[PDB]
Design a protein around this ligand. Structure first.
Ligand SMILES: OC[C@H]1O[C@H](O[C@H]2O[C@H](CO)[C@@H](O)[C@H](O)[C@H]2O)[C@H](O)[C@@H](O)[C@@H]1O
Length: 426
């Protein structure tokens, strides 16, 4: 099959993770789906707040593409929003995990039993797109958009500062600030600070971003690999950059085209991140089976021994290729991402393509082809493939007046920003 046909099959099948594969009570994205029905942790109906952020965006793609009808999409998104309104919130932030059937927190580790502002941010990036999509619809659609607007305005980003010039990832009603994870760059979390600056009700002053996230300029670096330079200081990953998903999550709604601030050119950094990851796979210094220009992309995913933050480098490449890395990079390296897609589909689909698209990860070296999926890995595939085609989520997210105001407050530039004209003196 041709690239154009395979693209459509891949996008549609991966979408179904979030439709057929959804938890049925909540309509939210499952943390995981195991095709054999075996869940070691009896956790099949635990839903991911961040992955469901990606999933609401995927629902919009399905409406646009005709994978579902507008009425299907609306009923589902109403079910999701109903769930989220009733679900456990901690100063406005959802927890990392909820039980789909009850809306109560499932602790992600003992002390992580309250708000998770980063996964909440991923949710909000997706809900804001839904809000923009339905804002001029019928009355029930407009009502939905308003219900989302209320959830948005209730997220208390300001609370998560704990009075400092940074944002904490967590807060618990009983463990208070003991998780103690101040979010400092560069990693996958940029969108949290953009949304915090954007909030009209519980926003942050800009120093929270420049001192906290950007470390008063120490986020700037220069990591050279294979002739490509990264100018952001990738946390713990200063040779090759982090797992490739860091160039995905915060860029599903926030368009990285022409996105720039005093710390970086985000298009160039994200694209260089991909290019370095791909070239590592091509050079294949560890001599793993099947690595090449037709099978590349290392990121966090299921792994031979459990789950690992795969990335370029001696210690991080475990011979595991995770299709979300190359596929979600579609906007940055479309012919290179398609190259892998086409080889995987035409040559490997018996082993690695299933009812919700490509499985999470595989190792040709270890003959390991798990029939397993994660929301956080399927969601960016649907979203970024669609953004490459149509810019659908980008156009929706970048159209939010609050997003534009947040970006201006943080001194970002973007071609989406409407610049105000001033005469010379007044
Ligand atoms: O609607 C006309 C323009 O309105 C604004 O510009 C006026 O007001 C500004 C602030 O007082 C002045 O600096 C400017 O000289 C005025 O023309 C807005 O900034 C413009 O983009 C509009 O075209």
């Amino acid at each position: 099959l041709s690239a154009d046909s395979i693209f459509n099959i891949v996008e549609e099948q991966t979408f179904q993770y979030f439709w057929d594969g959804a938890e049925p009570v909540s309509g939210m994205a499952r943390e995981r789906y195991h095709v054999d029905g075996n869940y070691p942790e009896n956790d099949m109906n635990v839903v991911t707040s961040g992955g469901s952020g990606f999933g609401v965006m995927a629902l919009l793609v399905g409406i646009e593409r005709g994978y579902i009808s507008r009425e299907q999409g609306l009923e589902r998104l109403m079910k999701i929003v109903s769930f989220l309104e009733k679900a456990d919130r901690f100063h406005g932030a959802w927890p990392h995990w909820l039980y789909g059937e009850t809306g109560k927190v499932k602790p992600f580790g003992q002390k992580d039993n309250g708000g998770d502002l980063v996964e909440t941010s991923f949710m909000i990036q997706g809900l804001l797109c839904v809000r923009q999509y339905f804002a001029n619809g019928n009355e029930q659609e407009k009502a939905l958009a308003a219900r989302i607007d209320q959830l948005w305005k209730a997220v208390e980003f300001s609370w998560y500062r704990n009075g400092k010039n940074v944002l904490y990832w967590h807060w618990s009603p009983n463990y208070k600030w003991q998780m103690n994870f101040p979010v400092t760059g560069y990693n996958e979390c940029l969108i949290m600070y953009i949304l915090a600056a954007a909030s009209p009700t519980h926003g942050i002053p800009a120093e929270v971003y420049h001192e906290g996230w950007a470390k008063s300029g120490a986020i700037k670096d220069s990591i050279n690999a294979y002739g490509h330079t990264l100018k952001l200081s990738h946390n713990f990953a200063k040779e090759y950059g982090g797992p490739l998903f860091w160039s995905h999550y915060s860029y599903l709604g926030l368009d990285p085209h022409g996105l720039k601030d005093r710390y970086a050119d985000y298009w160039e950094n994200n694209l260089n991140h991909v290019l370095i990851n791909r070239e590592w796979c091509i050079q294949n210094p560890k001599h793993y089976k099947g690595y090449g220009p037709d099978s590349w992309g290392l990121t966090a995913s299921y792994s031979v021994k459990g789950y690992a933050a795969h990335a370029p480098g001696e210690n991080n490449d475990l011979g595991v290729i995770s299709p979300t890395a190359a596929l979600s990079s579609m906007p940055y390296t479309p012919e290179y991402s398609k190259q892998a897609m086409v080889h995987w589909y035409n040559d490997m689909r018996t082993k690695i393509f299933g009812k919700y698209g490509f499985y999470d990860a595989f190792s040709e070296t270890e003959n390991w082809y798990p029939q397993q999926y994660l929301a956080i890995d399927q969601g960016p595939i649907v979203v970024m493939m669609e953004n490459y085609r149509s810019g659908l989520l980008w156009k929706l997210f970048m159209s939010c007046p609050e997003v534009q105001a947040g970006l201006k407050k943080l001194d970002f530039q973007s071609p989406y920003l409407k610049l105000e004209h001033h005469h010379h003196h007044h």
